[model samples]
Target: SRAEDYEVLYTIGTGSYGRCQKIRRKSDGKILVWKELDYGSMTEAEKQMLVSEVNLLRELKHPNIVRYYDRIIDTLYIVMEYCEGGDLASVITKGTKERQYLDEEFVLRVMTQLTLALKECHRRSDLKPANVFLDGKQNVKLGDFGLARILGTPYYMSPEQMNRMSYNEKSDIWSLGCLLYELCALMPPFTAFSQKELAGKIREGKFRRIPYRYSDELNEIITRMLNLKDYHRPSVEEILENPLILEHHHHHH
Candidate 1:
């Protein structure tokens, strides 16, 4: 697609790295997201990492993962699928006023769908609410990559990443645990005013029980996913294989 192919709608907002624009392709009148990576301010290595992520996104195609449509090299504009609803942060927070806590089956839909997306691709590196995009109540698309590194925020970081240790895909399991907890409790399992203490709590691997409204089965999975040792955390395959997730599999298909 040419630079003139799409008409730029008003920009959505900016994040740690760049701003997002909700655009419409002139040829087909299709809505899309155009991401502008703020360059010059970042180092060459940082920019290269972003480009590599772009390449990875180009390689991956899945219903649950955000679709990468086209990339403009000169302006560093990456075109992506437009999910009209918003991020999961909005889903969990604003939606909370009426429901208090989202239903467990809803959470299971998110877990299984999200894991299916992860199973198709590789590690997210950053797994948090804001990165998980939604198309209203029915669909989840895992978005955002090449983030949470420079931010140095540990809110969703695993114990290993919190300790500055090299981590793998299992580290995402810890973040998923946190995401699942937030789904029901509407809060991160570990919250500390001090970063040091937050890191410690992550290492300690202890948190208050989720709401009594949900089943113990859900709690067991969340607890297992949050295991401090990366090796002990469940794999994406295992999460999908679990009978609980399998029971609801056809509902999605």
Candidate 2:
């Protein structure tokens, strides 16, 4: 079907260069996310990056990864899954407002799915909560690939990313550690610092410890994932193999 066949509903979210809407299939009233890019307003580099994001999404397929249904190249519209529960950032913010934090079990659940998703992509430089989505059942789905090539937020960025050095899957490991820390603590691992200070801290591999009461296994996993030596950080496969994650998986089954 063509873009004209879809009925435009209301917008759901906005990104650095595009807007996402909840649109409907005119024939069946089936709802899906419609991410629109204004080709005229975007720079050549931005357009290329958007194209790359589309291609990347097309290649990724997993239960924990958002599904891409179709695209209209001439109009630059992408039709994909419409997650009803919103992104992880909003989920965390809402929890904080209620003076609550995600339980360790839920955090680990997210980590397991997220790490598995990353393994499918080989790696993901941007792994912040903002890019993660929740479905009606609150299952996690990672999305937003526009800035996958560049460094991500300093708060979740690895030392190599902050230093503008070469990074790998270990980079995403660091981000996973950061997200786990945030889930438990209800704030970033380095919330008190400015962007500049945060950058220096990340580069130096410095951050306050996780003060919340959590299992030793969780703490150890976070420590290893956030290690300053990027090469030393565990791979996604290794993380999934971790005793704690594995035990949890075995128990859940």
Candidate 3:
């Protein structure tokens, strides 16, 4: 496959390590995403790590999860599905932020799709949101497997991940809760000036909340999901039973 034959069409987004772009496949005249990484720009170790990421992502599959198409290791091209809808952060920032509101129904519906995708990821044994995506229809997709070993973000990093503890499906539930908190409130439950400070609070079992307008059902669902003690946290199925979620879902239907 002439993978390198495709030239850059346009850039889409930027993260701490790389750039995502819209690219066209010359052979089939189809459009897709290209996640570009630079070996010359990275340390030897980072380059190797990125290479490993490409290899691992190629093996995973799920519709709600970003699929890894062919890659050019030498050139560092990672082709992915073209998501025309854009990421959820844009929706939260541009659409929901101004209104100080989100359709609770839409949020939960997307959360449900995200949970299913996370369940697929956790089925492979890692749960994280840095890779999750929300399409224009508010559909959720899980992605970015390189750092997937870290069960949660440093701030919302489950105490178990911090303590080097082995986490299971419940850990996915926790991260989903954190994502929901960020969705409804417009920020993560915990954030500090630095990774060191964030890690310290997360490991110490801190999960802070602020007042915002929400239904009691919404509040209760978030509360159970944010429970600090891992053992006390509910399972994904159990989480689905929360009054806020259950009632809100039924109402929307």
Candidate 4:
């Protein structure tokens, strides 16, 4: 009501943790998303999370990542760029239900865009399909990056990251491999009973092949990215300049 002349259009989502609203700026009538974190009472750690997301968002200016505009300090409303299309999770849900798979060239094109953004993020500790968002053009906008700390979803966690073991810049490459596998297979690369079991699976780098429908080259890329050893994983730059990726990137332009 003060920092911005925002008119609340509707509530997009909410949980006990926070509330999200669709809002409009009076200046240009441009649409934006409002994130109001209302946990009733705040913890110091929670304050740190708010500090981190905006701090990280403010620093990143990639087109494939969401943009942050302003915030209301008193009430804590995070104003961010709006995307018309739903996130990739929902799209994948539909595809999963329909038993539909994304076209290879199209998937590669989107992957290239995602990798382009990841090029800026040396250690995107929270890389996952759920964090990968989309706009009206189906362009991927990596979001919800409160980044790290004691966070490891077994399905997406790299082996080195599983036991809270030491890791490096290459850990994100393993996460990216999981994402790419899910993109092609409509499911994650590794699934297990518990964290311990998942650790074993990921440590062994075991997962079913995406499918015969996709080319062997694409399958090979996924396998290479999901390596047990971080050193064995391909670099982000290497992923972009890959023959298949280069061809698709050209078409995207």
- Candidate maximizing TM-score: 4
Question: Each candidate: how many clashes?
Answer: 0, 0, 1, 0
Off by over 4 Å in 3: 3-7, 14-18, 41-48, 95-99, 126-130, 147-153, 162-164, 191-213, 240-253
Q: What is the TM-score of each candidate against the true structure?
A: 0.84, 0.82, 0.75, 0.87
What's the TM for model 1? 0.84
Q: Per-residue lDDT tens digits of candidate 3, residues 65-163?
A: 766677776646678877776766676676454867667876777666666666666677533344566554445677665634311235567767766
Ranking by TM-score: 4, 1, 2, 3
| Candidate 2 clash pair list | none
Q: Where does model 1 exceed 4 Å of error?
A: 15-18, 37-53, 96-99, 123-125, 147-153, 246-253
Candidate 4 residue-wise lDDT, 106-182, digit = tens: 57866787777778766444776667777766577777465222112558777776757887767878878888788
| lDDT (tens digit, per residue) of candidate 1 on 1-253 | 5768989897887877678899999988988988777576778887777767776667667778778899886657888888777888987887577667887888888898888777765743377888888764467788746423422256787777667888778887888989989988988898998888788778778898889988888888888898888888889988987767855532231
Question: Comparing 3 and 4 by TM-score, which wins?
Answer: 4
State model 1's lDDT. Answer: 0.78
Report clash pairs, candidate 1: none
Question: By the lDDT metric, which is better: model 3 or model 4?
Answer: 4
Query: Worst 10-residue stretch by lDDT in candidate 1?
Result: 144-153
**Candidate 1 vs 2: which has more TM-score:** 1
